[PDB]
Amino acid sequence: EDAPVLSKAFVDRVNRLNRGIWKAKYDGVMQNITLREAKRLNGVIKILPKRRFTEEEARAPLPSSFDSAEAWPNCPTIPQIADQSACGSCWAVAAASAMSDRFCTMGGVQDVHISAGDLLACCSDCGDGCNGGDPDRAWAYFSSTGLVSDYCQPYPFPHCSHHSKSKNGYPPCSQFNFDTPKCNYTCDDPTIPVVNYRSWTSYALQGEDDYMRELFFRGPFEVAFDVYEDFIAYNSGVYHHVSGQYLGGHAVRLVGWGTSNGVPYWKIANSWNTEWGMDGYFLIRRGSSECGIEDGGSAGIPLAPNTA
Numbered sequence: 001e002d003a004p005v006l007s008k009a010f011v012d013r014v015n016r017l018n019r020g021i022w023k024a025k026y027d028g029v030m031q032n033i034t035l036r037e038a039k040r041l042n043g044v045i046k047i048l049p050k051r052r053f054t055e056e057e058a059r060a061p062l063p064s065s066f067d068s069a070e071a072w073p074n075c076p077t078i079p080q081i082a083d084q085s086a087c088g089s090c091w092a093v094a095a096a097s098a099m100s101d102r103f104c105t106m107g108g109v110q111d112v113h114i115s116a117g118d119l120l121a122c123c124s125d126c127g128d129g130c131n132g133g134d135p136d137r138a139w140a141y142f143s144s145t146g147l148v149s150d151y152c153q154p155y156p157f158p159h160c161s162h163h164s165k166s167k168n169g170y171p172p173c174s175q176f177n178f179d180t181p182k183c184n185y186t187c188d189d190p191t192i193p194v195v196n197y198r199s200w201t202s203y204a205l206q207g208e209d210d211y212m213r214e215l216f217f218r219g220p221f222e223v224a225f226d227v228y229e230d231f232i233a234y235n236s237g238v239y240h241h242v243s244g245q246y247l248g249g250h251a252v253r254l255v256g257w258g259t260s261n262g263v264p265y266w267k268i269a270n271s272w273n274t275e276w277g278m279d280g281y282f283l284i285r286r287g288s289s290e291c292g293i294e295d296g297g298s299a300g301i302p303l304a305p306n307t308a
């Protein structure tokens with residue numbers, strides 16, 4: 001359990017087997033991560049109505065590549081990469097990030113960051129905080145209860161690095177194990193007034209076409225996939241699973257699609273900060289539910305604040 005996940009030999013095997021379609025790297029940022037730690041980063045554990053597309057949506061000829069940041073270039077939350085830190089809160093962090101993106105693509109508010117802290121601590125229905133939770137219930141909680149912004153309640157755990165000498169001066173993740181924070185009802189600075197943000201509807205997505213089409217019209221949303229040990233070593237290219245044991249479910253924010261040398265893929269924002277993968281992003285094979293990635297998405301529509 002305090003054993004390293006990765007070895008040079010494991011990585012060499014992965015890179016033989018993957019045929020150079022993606023690159024695994026041993027002495028990357030995850031070189032020394034242990035099994036206990038790697039498992040804690042995957043915090044998906046465990047219903048919404050299915051999305052229905054109108055006749056118009058359904059007949060759109062979707063382009064052969066698409067990137068949310070290019071399609072909504074005035075929405076500054078889209079390209080930001082989060083850091084869930086030493087806590088299994090991806091389910092909440094990928095939800096909050098996408099909710100912030102959607103306030104801009106749909107909800108008329110250019111730059112509000114939805115608080116993943118509030119959701120993590122207060123949505124007890126959703127799961128068990130830092131020990132993991134359920135993406136779908138997170139979206140349902142955004143409708144029924146609503147969430148404050150991170151200006152009100154900032155994410156309570158600092159960035160941490162799996163490198164021993166972090167490029168960004170982040171402290172080591174191993175020196176931390178965090179437990180679910182207490183749910184609060186005022187902002188950290190109590191003189192900042194509580195502003196509550198809410199969606200009016202939530203829904204589930206399934207399959208390559210649903211996903212593409214939802215992304216095209218409405219923008220980023222949250223998906224989950226199975227994490228194997230070879231994923232830990234990902235450095236670049238279009239991932240697909242070739243070796244390693246199952247490490248758990250992980251939620252992430254889907255932001256784009258394309259094709260690279262004949263391989264269709266999804267572009268995805270991870271939440272392990274910008275030191276990991278391709279500046280915080282990874283590509284993964286699209287079209288064949290690689291590691292279950294197309295088995296269920298969760299999304300919703302933010303309600304615009306105030307009135308006209």
Ligand SMILES: *[C@@H]1O[C@H](CO)[C@@H](O[C@@H]2O[C@H](CO)[C@@H](O[C@@H]3O[C@H](CO)[C@@H](O)[C@H](O)[C@@H]3O)[C@H](O)[C@H]2NC(C)=O)[C@H](O)[C@H]1NC(C)=O
Binds near residue numbers: 156157
């Ligand atoms: C709700 O408010 C509570 C109470 O203020 C927030 O709890 C506080 O969270 C911070 C950040 O983790 C904790 O800081 C730690 O303090 C310990 C002991 O002083 C120190 O050794 C650490 O280095 C770190 O500074 C603080 O202890 C903690 N307070 C309590 C009572 O647990 C909480 O995070 C807020 N909830 C949300 C969702 O943000």
Ligand SMILES: *[C@@H]1O[C@H](CO)[C@@H](O[C@@H]2O[C@H](CO)[C@@H](O)[C@H](O)[C@H]2NC(C)=O)[C@H](O)[C@H]1NC(C)=O
Binds near residue numbers: 031162163165
């Ligand atoms: C993983 O752990 C090994 C060994 O601790 C790291 O290697 C040490 O790195 C520090 C700083 O780079 C050096 O001063 C030591 O000489 C190294 N020790 C040995 C035995 O190699 C390695 O840097 C760690 N890798 C990462 C990415 O954090």
